RNA sequence: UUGGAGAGUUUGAUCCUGGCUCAGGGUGAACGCUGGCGGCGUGCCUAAGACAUGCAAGUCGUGCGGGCCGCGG
C-alpha cells in the first residue's frame with residue numbers, strides 16, 4: 001500500500017506513486033552476494049617459524 | 064620427640080621472583096570397558112515436589128453396663 005501525496009497534479013503523483021513501487025521491489029528483490037571465506041596464506045612460513053624455534057630450545061631445561 | 068622427599072613449565076644460557084600443572088590420600092558418588100564368590104558395611108546430597116494400595120498403635124473382663132453366637136439345663 002503506497003500513497004503519493006505531494007504534488008498539485010495527479011499524474012505526477014502517479015509517476016512517483018508508481019516508481020516508489022518499482023524501486024522498492026528492486027531493494028527487497030536483490031540480496032547481498034558471494035563469497036566467503038578466505039583461508040590463511042602464510043601459516044606455512046609464519047607458524048612453522050614458531051615451531052622451528054620452539055622445538056630447538058625445547059631440548060633444554062629447567063626453571 | 065616414630066615425624067617433614069618433590070618434578071614439569073618463562074632464557075641462547077643463568078640466578079632469583081612467580082603463577083600454572085602433575086604424581087598422594089580420601090567419597091553416601093557417578094560414567095566408560097569388564098565382570099566369578101563370600102562376609103561386614105552401605106545406598107534420593109536433586110523436588111522439605113506430587114502420590115494409587117497394603118502396613119507402620121495400641122491394649123485391659125482383675126474397672127462398669129450391654130449385644131451377637133458357641134456351650135451346661
Ligand SMILES: [Mg+2]
Nearest residue numbers: 034035036037
Ligand atoms: Mg564474505
Ligand SMILES: [Mg+2]
Nearest residue numbers: 057058060074
Ligand atoms: Mg625454552
Ligand SMILES: [Mg+2]
Nearest residue numbers: 063072081082
Ligand atoms: Mg615453581
Ligand SMILES: [Mg+2]
Nearest residue numbers: 073074080081
Ligand atoms: Mg622474560
Ligand SMILES: [Mg+2]
Nearest residue numbers: 067068087088
Ligand atoms: Mg604425603
Ligand SMILES: [Mg+2]
Nearest residue numbers: 086087088089
Ligand atoms: Mg586423587
Ligand SMILES: [Mg+2]
Nearest residue numbers: 097098099100
Ligand atoms: Mg555379574
Ligand SMILES: [Mg+2]
Nearest residue numbers: 095096097098
Ligand atoms: Mg554391564
Ligand SMILES: [Mg+2]
Nearest residue numbers: 102103104105
Ligand atoms: Mg549385602
Ligand SMILES: [Mg+2]
Nearest residue numbers: 107109110112
Ligand atoms: Mg523423592
Ligand SMILES: [Mg+2]
Nearest residue numbers: 107108109111
Ligand atoms: Mg532428602
Ligand SMILES: [Mg+2]
Nearest residue numbers: 107108109111
Ligand atoms: Mg542440603
Ligand SMILES: [Mg+2]
Nearest residue numbers: 110112113114
Ligand atoms: Mg510438581
Ligand SMILES: [Mg+2]
Nearest residue numbers: 109110112113
Ligand atoms: Mg518444584
Ligand SMILES: [Mg+2]
Nearest residue numbers: 117118119120
Ligand atoms: Mg504388621
Ligand SMILES: [Mg+2]
Nearest residue numbers: 123126127128
Ligand atoms: Mg470403672
